[PDB]
From Swiss-Prot:
Protein name in the entry: Bromodomain adjacent to zinc finger domain protein 2B
Gene designation per UniProt: BAZ2B
Portion of the full sequence shown: 2054 to 2166 of 2168
Tissue distribution: Expressed at varying levels in several tissues, whereas a smaller transcript was expressed specifically in testis.
Subunit structure: Component of the BRF-1 ISWI chromatin remodeling complex, at least composed of SMARCA1 and BAZ2B, which regulates the spacing of histone octamers on the DNA template to facilitate access to DNA. Within the BRF-1 ISWI chromatin remodeling complex interacts with SMARCA1; the interaction is direct. Component of the BRF-5 ISWI chromatin remodeling complex, at least composed of SMARCA5/SNF2H and BAZ2B, which regulates the spacing of histone octamers on the DNA template to facilitate access to DNA.
UniProt function note: Regulatory subunit of the ATP-dependent BRF-1 and BRF-5 ISWI chromatin remodeling complexes, which form ordered nucleosome arrays on chromatin and facilitate access to DNA during DNA-templated processes such as DNA replication, transcription, and repair. Both complexes regulate the spacing of nucleosomes along the chromatin and have the ability to slide mononucleosomes to the center of a DNA template. The BRF-1 ISWI chromatin remodeling complex has a lower ATP hydrolysis rate than the BRF-5 ISWI chromatin remodeling complex.
Subcellular location(s) per record: Nucleus
Top-level taxon of the source organism: Eukaryota
Record organism: Homo sapiens (Human)
Family according to the record: Belongs to the WAL family.
Length: 115
């Protein structure tokens, strides 16, 4: 509360460390469904159904331009990519499996880097 604070966690490396995680996600062999924005002109249903589209290239641009206020807003967008994927793709599909795999890959790196 006023004039009463928990000890200050060092957040000075968070930006660099989120960049590293994102590089690792970008270079994963199963990243291909997530590298670029879904083409809203060419994929029927996407625009109406997926209210907040997100992809790795959009997270990279947001990260690089100081549009993440803290490491939690960064994680929320990464998880949005996978939540969107599950909303639109059957579990038993190449894309559906890719999303489960990448969400696992992410959540481990997240825990190991920050928890």
């Amino acid at each position: 509360s006023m004039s009463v604070k928990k000890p200050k966690r060092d957040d000075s490396k968070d930006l660099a460390l989120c960049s590293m995680i994102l590089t690792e996600m970008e270079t994963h062999e199963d990243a291909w469904p997530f590298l670029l924005p879904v083409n809203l002109k060419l994929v029927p249903g996407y625009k109406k159904v997926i209210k907040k589209p997100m992809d790795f290239s959009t997270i990279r641009e947001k990260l690089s331009s100081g549009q993440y206020p803290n490491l939690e807003t960064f994680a929320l967008d990464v998880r949005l990519v996978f939540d969107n994927c599950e909303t639109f793709n059957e579990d038993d599909s190449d894309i559906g499996r890719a999303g489960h795999n990448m969400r696992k890959y992410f959540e481990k790196k997240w825990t190991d880097t920050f928890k």
